[PDB]
């Protein structure tokens, strides 16, 4: 599977930006673009050897972990640290079979009891997304945490917090130029901070956005989708145009 590398050590706005653009460019073929928004590969019929991309993360601590992302939804399904690999609990048999193809030379494989959806991770972590800081400092911490789970050094709530940091700074940032932007701003200003409601509500709505755009009537939505501004106020989007700067990838819905 293709491997895309990022290191927090000496990270800049340009090196993060280029990383996210490489992830996007390896997730999609670029042949399928609707409303100027690229569509990810269709799960149905997708050959196993095209199913996954790997993201190798390194940090100042000189530790490395490799995440596996499903090309069908850009989301993290598991990771490797050294000679151990760890997978979220698959939703079904076919996804269970699919993950057997990842990290196959590793000596210890484990499937967690819990899936990798946010509600489950936030419970394990004992913190919601709105209370977990993101930025290059958090990501450096999170890479160490996932590495030291393989040694016994990381406890479950820290591991779950660290998944939440990685999924937002990698998967969600690939899905949304707006979220890639939030991370670029944190790196620019050397800040760490939690996401605001606008970010959280977009993450929660990605699947529904994908469907509203792809089943739209030449860009016009059959019904509105509610999002949230940074101050938490709600508002409605009625068509694709205002989302083209915001959403970078969509899950495949229809031909």
């Amino acid at each position: 599977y293709p491997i895309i590398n990022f290191t927090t050590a000496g990270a800049t706005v340009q090196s993060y930006t280029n990383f996210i653009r490489a992830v996007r460019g390896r997730l999609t073929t670029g042949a399928d673009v609707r409303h100027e928004i690229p569509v990810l590969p269709n799960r149905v019929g997708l050959p196993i050897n095209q199913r996954f991309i790997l993201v190798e993360l390194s940090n100042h601590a000189e530790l490395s972990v490799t995440l596996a992302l499903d090309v069908t939804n850009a989301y993290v399904v598991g990771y490797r640290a050294g000679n151990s690999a760890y997978f979220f609990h698959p939703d079904n048999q076919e996804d269970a079979e699919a993950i057997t193809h990842l990290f196959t030379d590793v000596q210890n494989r484990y499937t967690f009891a819990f899936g990798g959806n946010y509600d489950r991770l936030e419970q394990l972590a004992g913190n919601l997304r709105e209370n977990i800081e993101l930025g290059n400092g958090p990501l450096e911490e999170a890479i160490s945490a996932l590495y030291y789970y393989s040694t016994g050094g990381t406890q479950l709530p820290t591991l779950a917090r660290s998944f939440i940091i990685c999924i937002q700074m990698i998967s969600e940032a690939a899905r949304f130029q707006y979220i890639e932007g939030e991370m670029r701003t944190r790196i620019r200003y050397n800040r760490r901070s939690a996401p605001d409601p606008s970010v959280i509500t977009l993450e929660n709505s990605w699947g529904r956005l994908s469907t509203a755009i792809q089943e739209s009537n030449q860009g016009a939505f059959a019904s509105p989708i509610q999002l949230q501004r940074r101050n938490g106020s709600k508002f409605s989007v009625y068509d694709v145009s205002i989302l083209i700067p915001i959403i970078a990838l969509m899950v495949y819905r229809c031909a």
Binding site: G181, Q228, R229, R230, V237, I242, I244, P245, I246
Partner: peptide
């Protein structure tokens, strides 16, 4: 284009 959230 990120103005919609401000």
């Amino acid at each position: 284009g990120f103005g919609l959230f401000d």
